[PDB]
């Protein structure tokens, strides 16, 4: 495995959020400096095919953002780039040229402030489902959920939450069938929502999770079956270290396997690899299928990647940064892992097939999604 | 400009007209409301004076100015809103201090009551409404929970230590931009210090002020002075716990919280210094305040590093007290976390010296920028406390010109009430210890006493290193000069420092001169055993003297007094010491252990000066005595017993041993009392011819008494 | 019987490849970290793990010439006393602190294998 450490050249800003859209990995500073990079260039740089001094961003610019909120939210697709501050939101349609697969200029980007909220109402999380085409807004004070259509920003529905249940983070269904929200009062809510935005709370799991006032990055299983629950409360002995609970979608969220974290502060960023990996044991004629999940704590620069079929983490990258990790991301094939931190320093993890095992095709993962339990259809009122 | 002046004159005229016929209260005081609303925008002292009148007329807020009179137009008291209180308090701050630093400004308590009213109307900052406030408080608690690393100190000195807080940007952001809790906490701390000088201050009063400092700090005001004040509050807490509570020192669990408070004060100071170092255009007043903060942090490091602490604030336990330990079998073991020291001690010594070196550097910088600045002896005093039992005065040429300056500042800034003895005291102690251990060249050491003869006021032959004698005689004459200086210390007012001079007198007379009789004569005035109506130790506490010295120091003096008495084996004065100590429970802590030690020394002195054979009286003599023979000999002895026929030492020792047996748990005084009885009263009558024996002893004691 | 704790295979150590001085105070660093068996170049078995620290490797790669600890302590403190009367990657002589004892303490504490593992099932203490 190749690890390349790169301190970014942004002065007095923190890189809070990252997005890997197609062959482009997009970076977002605190004060609005946004740099977008081709992932392939960094891949060749990590394998020393590209020199370090020749590496430059594809399009690096400044968002027209005011002083009212800071940016922690970037999402969207190759057509539209939805960038959200902690009080405002901008969507950038036509940001990437379709024909050349190159980034359009910011003048060619149809910039539009889609929503703005005011203090003390604070945005907690921004999610978008590609399968549903619906953008999800998570809001604090009051606790409400807003659903918005892709490329039109049409308010499809609104889900209002309890005042004591301040939302912290949300989890996207890879099949686009559900959505899972972690709240302030240790309560976990699952919603059955369709393409039209009609929602249905299907499960309410309280005193299960431990949340703190931070920004978190949690992914679901690529087969849409295993629910990771970091900082678990229920079932954990008191005054121990933190733990991550794995809950099965089809088995009513019983605890399957448990991750014993060290005694420090809990994980902040969790990312499943999109690829399903297989190690064929040639001696037994067996093939062990497994996923790889990258996890990182909320205080130190310590990151661990986890094999689902192993009793150990694969390796431990300890004290990589003096600061906390803001965001991590896999590549689309999952053979590259990106990670950003507060100290404006980039860490790219280049993998080979001998590093990871044989990755299964996405048709296999879709077929595994088809075995999962089907929900009753939403009654349209 | 002119609009505000004409408005002020008109408002004053109308207020005067209303007080002339007592009728401003018509139209619900909305005239007063409007006038208050307009005078909130007019920043001048005349508008301030009319605003004082407005606050006394409306909410009946009496603002005490010496040149001020109530314009009573018969208006009932109202309640001021928080919405009105915030720009009013901001106006009060901006008019009171303007461009002057409120820390450096004299504390006017005229505005203090109304400040408390505004604080009460504001109340605490309500949590659970801002993610910023909750997150910043959580980060603050984390940062206080962080252990102590030397790299953190390096980043403090380079200014790379930051918490990266975000300002909430709320309505009350401008109030903490005014530093409202900073000013209120400053007033609270000034009144606390005034009560501390009167010794009426209490630690429970500080928690509200600490919470106010937290609320000001979590607004991301970038005010390191708030960190300075919070560390100072923790420092004063630590001072109270260390001086006034020996039970917190002895209990390691309370010592954990003391180390926590030390760590919190240190973290506040390090954050303050790194915030100042993060400032680019640092003015001179920032240097003046941060120099003082450097002094406070160095003092706290000296406190936390040394005895009785001995680096407990650098030993770290995890918050999760139980470690899930993986066994080699694949089983998980809960394991208790241990305290782990997070910094080597040499780095701590480096940090202390670096703090004081940068303090001296900034003192030189400030004195170059302000030559009327008055220096402090405290740098030399802290360097001497570094020299305490560490160096031995190896740098004698460098020992000179720092203790020289310390003693010079101490005498030249000595007030008429009580001079600054402590640099000269520590100089005397270091000279004694290093002359006695021979670590120093005596010539320059005694030559520096010619400079310190400003404080000494004795002859120059005392400071001439007259090495034309035997070294012991030179040392003894030096002890005579030190005893002369001790008499000089008796000559000063000595507000609370008589006792340790008497301790040094005893240390001179016993350890060095061999005059145990002179030391006993000195300590008998301090410890009056042979009296009855007095206390054990006379440190002049009839009902007035404060505790703190006699808690531990009186115990230590009684320990040395037991050593003095055991040097000459006097048991009568030891028994009188025990008798006085039974009524001296409130005069010291650990009265039981000191009583046991005094019993041990009394019994050892009685066994040594008079002589005994203990393992014979109980196990051997008592089973071999015939009961009728014992009764006959004891009755003939009780009929025979005369106090004039026995020495007073023997009868008084028997009486004291039986009285202490009645006082304590029996076993400690069975041996001495039975030995005195069977050796001097029973057997000499037997050769001529436990309860029963101690009853006969009681009869003989009733014959003595 | 449960499957025993087989020993971790001897993985080749991670080695710093290229360090290029950026415009920031921290230079960009390229390190190859092997995540395979060093003898067979296979995917690691279930009982292997790679554990390492950053700044310890920084001081080891840049400054192998560590002198006597007490002599360096005396030299640094006498340097501080003589001065009385960030070079990231290079060893800062102006930095007085020596971390190597505390680095050893951290190495001992991380050398504990106790709290860092995976447990299949609920955490029930025996």
DSSP letters spanning B143-201: HHH----HHHHHHHHTT----------STTHHHHHTTHHHHHHHHHHHHHHHHHHTT--
Residue that the structure tokens 């360096």 belong to: C72
CA distance B344 to chain C (A): 7
Q: Does residue A337 sit within a domain? A: no
Rounded to the nearest 10°, the torsion over CA B86, B90, B96, B102 is 110
CA–CA separation, C99 and A370 (whole Å): 56
How many angstroms separate the Cα of A230 from the Cα of each of A234, A255, B262, C117?
Answer: 11, 12, 34, 15
Mutation target among A16, A119, A163 for the B interface, most CBs of B within 10 A: A119
Q: Is there a contact between B178 and B94 (Cβ–Cβ < 8 Å)?
A: yes
Nearest CA in chain C to B327: C114
Choose the mutation target among C2, C6, C13, C24 for the interface with A, i.e. most A CBs under 10 Å. C24
Breaks (C-N over 2.5 A) in chain A follow: none
The region, left, alpha or beta by phi > 0 then psi within -120 to 50, assigned to residue B315 is: beta
For residue B345, give Cα distances in angstroms to A2, B249, B520, C101: 39, 21, 42, 10
Answer whether A260 sits within 8 Å of C116, measured CB to CB.
yes
Same domain, C90 and C46: no
Both structure tokens of C98 = 């020596």
SS3 for chain C is CCCCCCCCCCCCCCEEEEEECCCCCCCEEEEECCCECCCCCCECCCCCCCEECHHHHHHHHHCCCCCCHHHHHHHHHHHHHHHHCCCCCCCCCCCCCCCHHHHHHHHHHHHCCCCCEEECCCCCCC
Same domain, C73 and C85: yes
| Alpha-carbon distances, residue B584 vs B371, B527, B562, B574, B580 (angstroms) | 54, 12, 16, 14, 6
Is there a domain that residue C87 lies in?
yes
Question: What's the angle, vertex CA A255, arms to CA A250 and CA A259, rounded to 5?
Answer: 125
DSSP for residue A153: -
**Chain A residues with CB-CB distance to B129 below 8 A:** 120, 141
> Does residue A243 fall inside a structural domain?
no
C35 in contact with chain A, both atoms CB, cutoff 8 A:
yes
CA distance B588 to B590: 7
Residue B49 half-sphere exposure, CB side, CA atoms within 13 Å? 12
Name which of A14, A68, A213 is nearest B135 (Cβ-Cβ): A213
Residues of chain B with Cβ-Cβ distance to C96 below 8 Å are: 347, 350-351, 354
Q: How far apart are CA C36 and CA A354, in angstroms?
A: 8
Solved using: cryo-EM
By the 8 A CB rule, do A329 and A37 touch?
no
SS3 content of chain A, % helix, strand, coil (to 5): 5, 45, 50
- Percentage helix, strand, coil for chain B under 3-state DSSP, each rounded to 5: 65, 0, 30
HSE-CB of C70 using CA atoms within 13 angstroms: 0
Look-up of token digits 């003015």: B283
Q: Which domain holds residue A40?
A: 17-116
The whole-angstrom distance between B667's CA and the closest CA on chain C is 49
Nearest-neighbour CA in chain B from C96: distance (Å): 7
Q: Are residues C37 and C86 in the same domain?
A: no
Work out how many domains chain A is built from and give that number.
1
Sheet holding C15-20, edge to edge: A325-330, A336-341, A345-350, A2-7, C28-32, C15-20
Mutate to test the interface with B, among C96, C100, C113 (most CBs of B within 10 A): C96
Q: Cα separations (Å) of B76 from A109, B37, B60, B81?
A: 65, 19, 8, 16
The strand pairing partners of A267, in sequence order, are A297
Under 8 Å CB-to-CB from B132, ≥6 apart: which residues?
A122, B166, B167, B168
Is residue C64 a part of any domain in this protein?
yes
Task: Report the SS3 class of residue B534.
Answer: coil
- Shared domain check, C44 and C5: yes
Within a domain: residue A91?
Answer: yes
Tokens representing A377?
Answer: 């259809």
To the nearest whole Å, the CA of B317 is away from the closest chain C CA by 13
Measured distance CA(B452)–CA(A142) in Å, rounded: 73
Kindly give the pairing relationship between strand A59-62 and strand A33-38.
antiparallel
Chain B nearest-CA residue for C75: B350
Give me the phi and psi of A180, to 5 degrees please.
Answer: -120, 130
Instruction: Provide the 8-state DSSP code for B330.
Output: S
Same domain, C108 and C57: yes
Q: How far is CA B400 from the centre of its chain?
A: 30
Distance CA B220, CA B218 (A): 5
CA A346 – CA A190 distance, rounded (Å): 34
CA B586 to CA B559: how far, in whole Å? 18
DSSP assignment string, B469-514: S-HHHHHHHHHHHHHHHHHHHHHS--SS-SHHHHHHHHHIIIIIS-
Q: Among partner residues A257, A312, A317, which is closest to C117 by beta-carbon distance?
A: A312
B582 conformational bin, left if phi > 0, alpha if psi -120 to 50, beta if neither: alpha
β-pair type (A313-317, C51-52): parallel
The CATH number covering residue A29 comes to: 2.40.128
**Nearest by Cα to B229 from B191, B172, B182:** B182
CA distance B272 to B223: 8
Contact A214 B135 (CB under 8 A): yes
Residue A318 in contact with partner chain C when CB distance is under 8 A = yes
CB atoms within 10 A of CB C94: 11
Domain assignment of residue C57, yes or no: yes
- The answer to whether B690 touches B698, Cβ cutoff 8 Å, is no
Interface membership of A112 toward C (CB under 8 Å): no
| Domain count within chain C | 2
Using a CB–CB cut-off of 8 Å, the residues of B that contact A are 129-132, 134-135, 138, 142, 164, 166, 169-170, 318, 320-324, 326, 332, 334, 337
d(CA A94, CA B652): 110
Q: Best residue in B127, B131, B135 to probe A by mutation, most A CBs within 10 Å?
A: B131
* Omega of the bond leading into A74 within 30 degrees of 0 (cis): no
Residues belonging to chain B:
705
SS (H, E, C) B331-382: CEEEEECCCEECCCHHHHHHHHHHHHHHHHHHHHHHHHHCCCCCCCCHHHHH
Q: How many CB atoms lie within 10 A of CB B334?
A: 14
DSSP state of B617: I
Under DSSP, is residue A150 helix (H, G, I), strand (E, B) or coil? Answer: coil
Task: Please answer whether residues B135 and A215 qualify as being in contact, where contact means their C-beta atoms are separated by less than 8 angstroms.
Answer: no
CB C44 within 8 A of CB C36: yes
Does C123 fall in a domain? no
Residues sharing a CB contact under 8 Å with residue C119, sequence separation 6 or more, in sequence order: A258, A260, B332
- CB A256, CB A247: distance < 8 Å: yes
Q: Please give the structure tokens belonging to residue C87.
A: 């070079």
Question: Rounded to an integer, what is the distance from CA B480 to the centroid of its chain?
Answer: 32
- Nearest Cα neighbor of C112 from A1, B315, B338 is B338
Token pair belonging to A65: 């953002």
Domain ranges, ordered by start, for chain B: 2-119, 131-322+338-348, 412-608, 612-704
- Do A120 and B129 count as a contact with CB atoms less than 8 A apart? yes
Expressed as residue numbers, the domain containing C15 is 1-51
At which of C33, C51, C69 does a domain end?
Answer: C51
Tokens of A177: 């069938």
């Amino acid at each position: 495995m190749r690890l390349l450490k790169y301190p970014l050249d942004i002065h007095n800003e923190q890189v809070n959020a990252l997005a890997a859209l197609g062959p482009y990995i997009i970076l977002a500073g605190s004060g609005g400096h946004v740099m977008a990079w081709r992932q392939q260039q960094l891949v060749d740089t990590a394998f020393d095919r590209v020199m370090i001094k020749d590496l430059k961003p594809e399009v690096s610019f400044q968002v027209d953002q005011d002083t009212t909120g800071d940016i922690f939210f970037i999402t969207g697709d190759l057509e539209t780039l939805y960038i959200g501050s902690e009080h405002r939101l901008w969507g950038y349609s036509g940001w990437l040229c379709r024909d050349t697969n190159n980034i359009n200029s910011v003048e060619k980007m149809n910039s539009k402030l889609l929503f703005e909220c005011k203090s003390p109402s604070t945005i907690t999380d921004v999610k978008y489902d590609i399968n549903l085409g619906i953008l999800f807004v998570l809001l604090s004070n009051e606790n409400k959920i807003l659903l918005f259509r892709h490329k039109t920003f049409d308010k499809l529905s609104e889900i209002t939450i309890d005042k004591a249940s301040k939302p912290i983070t949300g989890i996207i269904d890879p099949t686009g069938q559900t959505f899972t929200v972690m709240t302030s009062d240790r309560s976990i809510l699952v919603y059955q929502i369709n393409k039209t935005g009609t929602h249905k709370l299907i499960n309410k799991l309280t005193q299960h999770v431990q949340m703190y006032p931070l920004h978190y990055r949690i992914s679901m299983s690529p087969q849409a079956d295993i629910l990771p629950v970091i900082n678990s409360v229920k079932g954990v002995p008191n005054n121990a270290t933190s733990c991550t609970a794995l809950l099965d979608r089809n088995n009513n969220y019983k605890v399957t396997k448990t991750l014993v974290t060290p005694s420090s502060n809990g994980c902040r960023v969790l990312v499943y690899s999109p690829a399903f990996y297989e190690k064929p044991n040639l001696k037994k004629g067996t093939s062990t299928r497994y996923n790889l999940i990258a996890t990182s704590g909320s205080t130190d620069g310590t990151i661990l990647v986890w094999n689902t079929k192993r009793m150990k983490p694969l390796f431990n990258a300890l004290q990589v940064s003096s600061t906390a990790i803001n965001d991590m991301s896999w590549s689309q094939d999952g053979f590259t892992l990106f990670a950003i931190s507060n100290d404006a320093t980039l860490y790219t993890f280049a993998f080979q097939e001998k590093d990871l095992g044989v990755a299964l095709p996405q048709t296999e993962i879709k077929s595994l999604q088809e075995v999962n339990k089907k929900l009753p259809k939403l009654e349209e009122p | 400009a002119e609009q505000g002046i004409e408005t002020t004159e008109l408002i004053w005229s109308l207020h005067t007209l209303f007080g002339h016929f007592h009728f401003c209260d018509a139209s619900n005081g909305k005239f007063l409301d409007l006038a208050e609303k307009l005078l909130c925008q007019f920043i001048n002292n005349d508008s301030f004076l009319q605003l004082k009148q407005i606050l006394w007329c409306r909410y009946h807020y009496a603002i005490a100015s010496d040149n001020f009179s109530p314009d009573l137009h018969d208006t009932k008291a109202v309640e001021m809103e928080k919405i009105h209180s915030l720009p009013l308090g901001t106006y009060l701050i901006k008019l009171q201090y303007q461009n002057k630093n409120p820390y450096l400004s004299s504390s006017k308590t005229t505005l203090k009551q109304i400040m408390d009213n505004i604080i009460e109307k504001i109340g605490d900052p309500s949590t659970l409404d801002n993610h910023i406030i909750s997150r910043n408080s959580f980060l603050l608690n984390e940062y206080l929970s962080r252990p102590i690393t030397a790299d953190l100190l390096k980043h403090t000195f380079s200014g790379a230590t930051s918490l990266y807080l975000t300002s909430p940007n709320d309505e009350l952001q401008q109030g903490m931009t005014a530093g409202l809790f900073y000013v209120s906490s400053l007033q609270s701390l000034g009144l606390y210090k005034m009560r501390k000088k009167s010794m009426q201050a209490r630690p429970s009063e500080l928690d509200s002020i600490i919470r106010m400092l937290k609320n000001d700090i979590i607004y991301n005001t970038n005010r390191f002075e708030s960190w300075i004040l919070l560390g100072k509050c923790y420092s004063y807490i630590v001072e109270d716990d260390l001086i006034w509570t020996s039970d917190k020192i002895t209990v390691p669990e309370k010592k954990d919280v003391i180390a926590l408070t030390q760590r919190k004060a240190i973290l506040c100071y390090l954050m303050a210094i790194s915030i100042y170092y993060s400032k680019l255009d640092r003015t001179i007043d920032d240097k003046k305040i941060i120099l003082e903060a450097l002094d406070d942090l160095g003092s706290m490091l000296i406190s936390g590093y040394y005895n009785p602490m001995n680096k407990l604030c650098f030993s770290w336990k995890s918050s999760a007290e139980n470690t899930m330990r993986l066994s080699e079998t694949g089983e998980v073991v809960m394991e208790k976390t241990k305290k782990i020291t997070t910094i080597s001690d040499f780095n701590i010594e480096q940090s202390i010296f670096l703090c004081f070196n940068r303090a001296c550097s900034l003192s030189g910088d400030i004195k170059s920028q302000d030559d009327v600045f008055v220096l402090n002896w405290s740098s030399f005093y802290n360097l001497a406390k570094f020299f305490f039992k560490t160096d031995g005065g190896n740098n004698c040429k460098l020992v000179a010109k720092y203790i020289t300056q310390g003693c010079q500042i101490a005498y030249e800034s000595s007030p008429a009430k009580d001079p600054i003895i402590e640099p000269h005291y520590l100089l005397v102690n270091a000279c004694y210890k290093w002359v006695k251990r021979g670590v120093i060249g005596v010539n320059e050491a005694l030559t520096l006493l010619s400079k310190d003869n400003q404080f000494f006021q004795e002859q120059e032959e005392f400071w001439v290193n007259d090495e034309g004698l035997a070294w012991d005689y030179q040392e003894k004459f030096f002890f005579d000069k030190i005893i002369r200086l001790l008499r000089h210390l008796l000559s000063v007012d000595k507000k609370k420092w008589q006792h340790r001079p008497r301790y040094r007198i005893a240390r001179i007379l016993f350890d060095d001169l061999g005059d145990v009789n002179g030391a006993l004569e000195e300590m008998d005035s301090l410890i009056s055993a042979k009296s009855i109506n007095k206390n054990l130790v006379n440190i002049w506490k009839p009902d007035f003297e404060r505790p703190g010295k006699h808690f531990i120091y009186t115990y230590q003096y009684l320990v040395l007094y037991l050593d003095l008495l055991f040097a000459i084996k006097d048991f009568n004065t030891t028994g009188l010491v025990i008798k006085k100590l039974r009524r001296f429970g409130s005069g010291t802590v650990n009265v039981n252990e000191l009583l046991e030690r005094a019993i041990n020394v009394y019994t050892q002195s009685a066994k040594i000066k008079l002589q005994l054979q203990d393992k014979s009286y109980v196990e051997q003599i008592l089973p071999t005595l015939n009961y009728q023979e014992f009764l006959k000999i004891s009755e003939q002895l009780n009929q025979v017993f005369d106090q004039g026929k026995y020495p007073e030492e023997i009868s008084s020792g028997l009486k004291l041993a039986f009285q202490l047996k009645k006082g304590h748990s029996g076993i400690a005084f069975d041996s001495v009392c039975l030995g005195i009885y069977f050796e001097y009263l029973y057997f000499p009558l037997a050769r001529q011819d436990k309860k029963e024996v101690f009853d006969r002893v009681r009869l003989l004691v009733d014959k003595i008494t | 019987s449960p499957k025993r704790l087989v020993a971790a295979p001897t993985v080749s150590p991670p080695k710093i490849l290229q360090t290029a001085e950026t415009k920031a105070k921290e230079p960009s660093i390229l390190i190859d970290v092997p995540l395979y068996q060093a003898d067979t170049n296979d995917y690691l078995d279930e009982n292997g793990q790679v554990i390492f620290n950053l700044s310890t490797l920084i001081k080891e790669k840049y400054h192998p010439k560590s002198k006597e600890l007490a002599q360096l302590k005396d030299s640094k403190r006498n340097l501080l006393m003589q001065l009385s009367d960030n070079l990231i990657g290079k060893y800062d002589v102006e930095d007085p602190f020596i971390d190597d004892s505390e680095l050893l303490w951290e190495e001992q504490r991380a050398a504990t294998k106790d709290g860092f593992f995976v447990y299949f099932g609920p955490l029930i203490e025996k």
